[PDB]
């Protein structure tokens, strides 16, 4: 077959019932995740190749970056609660990996303030139990599939993308192969 288990994707031993339709995991410390956002725009191209209104979920992970890695998961929960993912994703990535100006939770906060989120608004969300629950959902989804590496995408809690099995000579061909595989698994 053109799409084969083990080539463009793998199948989880234990499927996760009730998982989001398209679930991505990333970390701002993850170098390929930087490429996936700034260079390849994987999420946007995947969303485009999916039907209108299909839910896509993107979660941060703790296992990279020690203390600051956990701060960034809580901050991503703040981004999701306020709906400002599209405003902080790039400066958080560049702050961690490019300029390396993010070394504390306050430095993360500065990215949100520079993005236009008010101080009282960020601090209230940061300490809110709505964000606490959002942090738990990110941890629960990662623990559900024993996640040990990022970037990672899961389709309907049963299939895991395998980008190592695609072509990486052409960036644009890789993205299109990746998105078509998500679409293929979506229709399974
Ligand atoms: C979860 C495993 N994991 C972590 C460990 N790890 C580090 C390096 C390799 N593995 C991954 O990063 C897996 C991975 C993902 C994608 C990928 O393919 C490309 C990456 C970037 C670009 C660009 N620009 C292209 C075109 C393709 C290759 C590997």
From Swiss-Prot:
It is found in: Periplasm. GO terms for biological process: cellular response to antibiotic. Disruption phenotype: Induction of the PhoP/PhoQ two-component regulatory system, suppressed by 50 uM CuSO(4). Gene3D superfamilies: Glutaredoxin (3.40.30.10). One of its GO terms (molecular function) is protein-disulfide reductase activity. Residues 1-131 form the Thioredoxin domain. Keywords: Disulfide bond, Periplasm, Redox-active center, Signal. The keyword Signal applies. CDD domains: DsbA_DsbA. One of its GO terms (cellular component) is outer membrane-bounded periplasmic space. Transmembrane segments: none annotated. The keyword Signal applies. It holds the Pfam family DSBA. Disulfide bonds join 30-33. Belongs to the thioredoxin family. DsbA subfamily. Required for disulfide bond formation in some periplasmic proteins such as PhoA or OmpA. Acts by transferring its disulfide bond to other proteins and is reduced in the process. DsbA is reoxidized by DsbB. Required for pilus biogenesis. PhoP-regulated transcription is redox-sensitive, being activated when the periplasm becomes more reducing (deletion of dsbA/dsbB, treatment with dithiothreitol). MgrB acts between DsbA/DsbB and PhoP/PhoQ in this pathway. This is Thiol:disulfide interchange protein DsbA. It comes from Escherichia coli (strain K12).
């Amino acid at each position: 077959a053109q799409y084969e288990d083990g080539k463009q994707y793998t199948t989880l031993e234990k499927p996760v019932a009730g998982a989001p339709q398209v679930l991505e995991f990333f970390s701002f410390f993850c170098p390929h995740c930087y490429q996936f956002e700034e260079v390849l725009h994987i999420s946007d191209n995947v969303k485009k190749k999916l039907p209108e209104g299909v839910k896509m979920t993107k979660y941060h992970v703790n296992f990279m970056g020690g203390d600051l890695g956990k701060d960034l998961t809580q901050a991503w929960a703040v981004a999701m609660a306020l709906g400002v993912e599209d405003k902080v994703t790039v400066p958080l990535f560049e702050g961690v990996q490019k300029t390396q100006t993010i070394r504390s939770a306050s430095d993360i906060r500065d990215v949100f303030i520079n993005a236009g989120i008010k101080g009282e608004e960020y601090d209230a969300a940061w300490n809110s139990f709505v964000v606490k629950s959002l942090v738990a959902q990110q941890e629960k989804a990662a623990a559900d599939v024993q996640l040990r590496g990022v970037p990672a995408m899961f389709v309907n809690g049963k299939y895991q993308l395998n980008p190592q099995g695609m072509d990486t000579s052409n960036m644009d061909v890789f993205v299109q192969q990746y998105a078509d595989t998500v679409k293929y698994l979506s229709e399974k």
